[PDB]
Write a protein that binds this DNA or RNA. Structure first.
Ligand SMILES: OC[C@H]1O[C@@](CO)(O[C@H]2O[C@H](CO)[C@@H](O)[C@H](O)[C@H]2O)[C@@H](O)[C@@H]1O
Lengths: 555, 418
DNA sequence: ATCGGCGCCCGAACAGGGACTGTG
DNA sequence: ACAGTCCCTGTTCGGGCGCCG
């Protein structure tokens, strides 16, 4: 199968650059005879041409085993050429998911053999792919070659082959507008609604069409029967599942090992409902030593046990039905952790997932729930091209008082309430008017910019005062610390007057969790109270108790 | 017709903006549009060897079912070269109508050395196929350079109608033609059809509005009335009895308003809170404090003097969510030197969709900035970045896109709406 | 050791902007 | 008026998972 008659993609170097001139590093003898045998072979196949001293460029070459294969993959350390090659706009915008596949009568999975080695390379650019094979005898100079096809390891090869494959399939796709072809690199998911007999006729038309364009479809890579191994999934006729996940078992773990376990748990969370990785990812904080050994914490081990528990049972996904509505339901599992399932028929999930991002230093469950709703919305647009209907564990009245009372514009699409505890609630609520018969606290705090030492205190209308000295603190922390004092030394109903927009803006957002230990203490006090009114006055304006407490803490 | 040479500003590359996900409704509409533009030679397919990209998406036209392809040419326009009088009476006209003449640009070819920068990529659902990339061969809608290159042809097309109707103000901004007159609403709508047919002798206009008697809120960006735009004054509460808390809110409001109004004084009001009183304690206003408040009421009622527009400085607009579907906004160039303070209320998605409201308010604020000054302001949006980027395309219907940033404002700005 | 391109997650360095404070 | 410190958000790059040559 000669090289593809497709037009070469024009490739340039970065402006004002030349090609790579890197010397060849030593190679082992097992690989030298294999590269020589391979290079003379892939010269016979036309992929490679011999070059002379006129070519002043070079790139080091080696040869590794092909992925899960007895064939050798010829790889080149084109790190120097990639820096000098023009940038491309990658056309691969994402990864196809089986949950977005519709039901089809006939399914075929193809794979093009020697994909990159079938597409020619721009003739003017071939000079820069020059490389030298050092011989065994150091006295021999070594054989120089250049590439005639897309080399493996070049930054432009994936995009050019992807672009080239689309041009090859365009005529066939037009000749068969009703045949669905999911195209990712060299793997071809072909689906039609024809009968099984007439479908193999069109597949052969497709294989012959690709063969005319220099794209062979080997029988070793031709799948004709479900189950289908496609994009790391197992595609049964009416259900889909993930290829076997292998979690490592070790007595002691390292940073790298934790990093692999978190990743595989994320890859599993697309269909396994309930995966948690918050406590396992916490072990990756601070330690940049990849081979450092980490003892599993009590919370981390519990998380690993939970994941293995739901991984021992097999889970399957369903395909997409364009006629039926898309539904997603979210549940609050842990603090800051969420899991969701997208389905059409109950208990027949298309896919699952999780959102466990802490957005901001201070937040609440309603914010995180709205952040997770948006992540699902975007993910749903990619897979199914439409926004799903929502089933959320938050009261209709809970959300109404939040979005109407919140200063930012927040919205959630069409959703219905489901009574699946734990529900999302506002743990406390600030009064809109000052409380009658509630002790009024005028709080403030200060800190020195050089000394980092500060004070924080309050004065009340009942004459009560307090000032606490603080060490290693800031201005922002002392104003929060002053509000904490007023909440501590008050009854169940208190009026607090601060001059810190920073402290006011944090509390007014009704957070229930915070990266700051002090704010979490303030949150804990606010939930214990029965009525709290927080008011703001401008500092340094001779206003009420603000002036009395200002002189107490600035000294 | 030979193409006009276009360069980028010195030392700047083309735009490289990723394409954001689109709905099947929008993708199927875009593929049909781009395939027709390729047949008529208006665009052409390109490959990954073009390293530039600009996001594309589709919107449903104003009071119509047809789709309009909208390019987010914000990045290309910042990096595009600059080319080479604003009608002050357009904002004084009774009725002003916006006509989409962006279709006229598709008749002028674009400079070959420049077409590489107009590349965009159409995505596919579930990443079935790679992105199909196109570039423009003619003047594109939404490009900063398109109205400038076409300016010579536009003055020529409009001159007979403008001399035949000298009382009609006609301003052009990007794809839109702003047509203002003082005629009655019915005679005004007839004059718009006279201009459309006069334009039709050369270049086509967006399909006739299916409704001709102005349904409610379908003509938001279509039929606008500038002579009825009102500014939102700063107001102070009027109470028979004042508490310590009520005076503190008043003093804090007046001290903030003193940054916009010079003569605001709060000393006699602050004297009323000199103790360490309870927030709910009623405080009688002294004779000195009552006078200080009444003069401040006069100052907040009087307009600000000495605030003029600077054509060299960018415009900035800030919006505040006031609740109950009401949104306050201010347009300025220097802090506390507002060129206009307005209020928009009761917008679409009543008491359900906050985002639909904000998206409409941004468009309404932008329309005013184009009508009044001929610029677009940079918006400080009171919304989360992901909340806005997820939904804003679903409610956008303008041919332009203003620059924006996202801010988390503390809700102590009760100082703009009562 | 020793590769390309894409997407996702989680963690952290860096930068940008706004407000407060101290100072000429 | 200018210069810092703090805090906060956002972007970018690194690890990992997964896909494919
Ligand atoms: O909305 C932020 C978002 O905008 C992007 C792409 O949409 O950049 C474009 O939009 C900005 C919004 O103002 C413009 O400033 C910018 O010029 C334009 O390219 C991304 O930067 C960002 O994700």
């Amino acid at each position: 199968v000669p090289i593809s008659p497709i037009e070469t993609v024009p490739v340039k170097l970065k402006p004002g650059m030349d090609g790579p001139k890197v010397k060849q590093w030593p190679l082992t003898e097992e690989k030298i005879k294999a590269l020589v045998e391979i290079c003379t072979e892939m010269e016979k196949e036309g992929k490679i041409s011999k070059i002379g001293p006129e070519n002043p460029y070079n790139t080091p070459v080696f040869a590794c085993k092909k992925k899960d294969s007895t064939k050798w993959r010829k790889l080149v350390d084109f790190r120097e050429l990639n820096k000098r090659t023009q940038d491309f706009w990658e056309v691969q915008l994402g990864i196809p998911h089986p949950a977005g596949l519709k039901k089809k009568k006939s399914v075929t999975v193809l794979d093009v053999g020697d994909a990159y080695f079938s597409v020619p390379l721009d003739e003017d650019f071939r000079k820069y792919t020059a490389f030298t094979i050092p011989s065994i005898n150091n006295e021999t100079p070594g054989i120089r070659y250049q590439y005639n096809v897309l080399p493996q390891g070049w930054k432009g090869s994936p995009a050019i082959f992807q672009s080239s494959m689309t041009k090859i399939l365009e005529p066939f796709k037009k000749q068969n507008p009703d045949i669905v072809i999911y195209q990712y690199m060299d793997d071809l998911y072909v689906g039609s609604d024809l009968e099984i007999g007439q479908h193999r006729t069109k597949i052969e038309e497709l294989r012959q069409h690709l063969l005319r364009w220099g794209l062979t479809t080997p029988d070793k890579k031709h799948q004709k029967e479900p189950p289908f191994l496609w994009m790391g999934y197992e595609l049964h006729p009416d259900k889909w599942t993930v290829q076997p996940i292998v979690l490592p078992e070790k007595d002691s773990w390292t940073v790298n090992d934790i990093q692999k376990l978190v990743g595989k748990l994320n890859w599993a969370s697309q269909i396994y409902p309930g995966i948690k990785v918050r406590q396992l990812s916490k072990l990756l904080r601070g330690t940049k030593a990849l081979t450092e050994v980490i003892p599993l914490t009590e919370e981390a081990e519990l998380e690993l046990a939970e994941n293995r528990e739901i991984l021992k049972e097999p889970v399957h996904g369903v395909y997409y039905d364009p006629s039926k509505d898309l539904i997603a339901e979210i549940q609050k599992q842990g603090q800051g952790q969420w899991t969701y399932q997208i389905y059409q028929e109950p208990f027949k999930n298309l896919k699952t997932g999780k959102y466990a991002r802490m957005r901001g230093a201070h937040t609440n469950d309603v914010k995180q729930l709205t952040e997770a709703v948006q992540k699902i919305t975007t993910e749903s647009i990619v897979i199914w091209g439409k926004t799903p209907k929502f089933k959320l564990p938050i009261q209709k009245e809970t959300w109404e008082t939040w979005w109407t009372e919140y200063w930012q514009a927040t919205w959630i699409p069409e959703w219905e309430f489901v009574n699946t505890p734990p529900l999302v609630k506002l743990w406390y609520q600030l009064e809109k008017e000052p409380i009658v018969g509630a002790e009024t606290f005028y709080v403030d705090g200060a800190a020195n910019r050089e000394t980092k030492l500060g004070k924080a205190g309050y004065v009340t209308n009942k004459g009560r005062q307090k000032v606490v000295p603080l060490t290693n603190t800031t201005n922002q922390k002392t104003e929060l610390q002053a509000i904490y004092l007023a909440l501590q030394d008050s009854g169940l109903e208190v009026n607090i007057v601060t001059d810190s927009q920073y402290a006011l803006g944090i509390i007014q957002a009704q957070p229930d969790k915070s990266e700051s230990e002090l704010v979490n203490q303030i949150i804990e006090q606010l939930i214990k109270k029965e009525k709290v009114y927080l008011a703001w006055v401008p500092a340094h304006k001779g206003i009420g108790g603000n002036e009395q407490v200002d002189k107490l803490v600035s000294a | 017709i030979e193409t006009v040479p276009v360069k980028l500003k010195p030392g700047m590359d083309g735009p490289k903006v990723k394409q954001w996900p689109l709905t099947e409704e929008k993708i199927k509409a875009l593929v049909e549009i781009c395939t027709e533009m390729e047949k008529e030679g208006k665009i052409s397919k390109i490959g990954p060897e073009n390293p530039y990209n600009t996001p594309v998406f589709a919107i449903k036209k104003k009071d119509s079912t047809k789709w309009r392809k909208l390019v987010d040419f914000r990045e290309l326009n910042k990096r595009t070269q600059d080319f080479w009088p604003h009608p002050a009476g357009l904002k004084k006209k009774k009725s002003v109508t916006v006509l989409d003449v962006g279709d006229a640009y598709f008749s002028v070819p674009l400079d070959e050395d420049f077409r590489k920068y107009t590349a965009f990529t159409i995505p596919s659902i579930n990443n079935e196929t790679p992105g199909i990339r196109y570039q423009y061969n003619v003047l594109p809608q939404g490009w900063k350079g398109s109205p400038a290159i076409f300016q010579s042809s536009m003055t020529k097309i409009l001159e007979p109608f403008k001399k035949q109707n000298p009382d009609i103000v006609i301003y052009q901004y990007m794809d839109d033609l702003y047509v203002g007159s003082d005629l009655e609403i019915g005679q005004h709508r007839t004059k718009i059809e006279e201009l459309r047919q006069h334009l039709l002798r050369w270049g086509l206009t967006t399909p006739d509005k299916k409704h001709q008697k102005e349904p409610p809120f379908l003509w938001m960006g279509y039929e606008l009335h500038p002579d009825k735009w009102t500014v939102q004054p700063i107001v102070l509460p009027e109470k028979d009895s004042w508490t310590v808390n009520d005076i503190q809110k008043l003093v804090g409001k007046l001290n903030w308003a003193s940054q916009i109004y010079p003569g605001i004084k709060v000393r006699q009001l602050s004297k009323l809170l000199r103790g360490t009183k309870a927030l709910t304690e009623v405080i009688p206003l002294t004779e000195e404090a009552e006078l200080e408040l009444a003069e401040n009421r006069e100052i907040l009622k009087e307009p600000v003097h000495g605030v003029y527009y600077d054509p060299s400085k960018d415009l900035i607009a800030e919006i505040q969510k006031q609740g109950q579907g009401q949104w306050t906004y201010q347009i300025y160039q220097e802090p506390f030197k507002n060129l206009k303070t307005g209020k928009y209320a009761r917008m679409r998605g009543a008491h359900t969709n906050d985002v639909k409201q904000l998206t409409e308010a941004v468009q309404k604020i932008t329309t005013e900035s184009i009508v009044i000054w001929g610029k677009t302001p940079k918006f400080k949006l009171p919304i989360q970045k992901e909340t806005w980027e997820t939904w804003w395309t679903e409610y956008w219907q303008a041919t332009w896109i203003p620059e924006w940033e996202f801010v988390n404002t503390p809700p102590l700005v009760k100082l703009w709406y009562q």
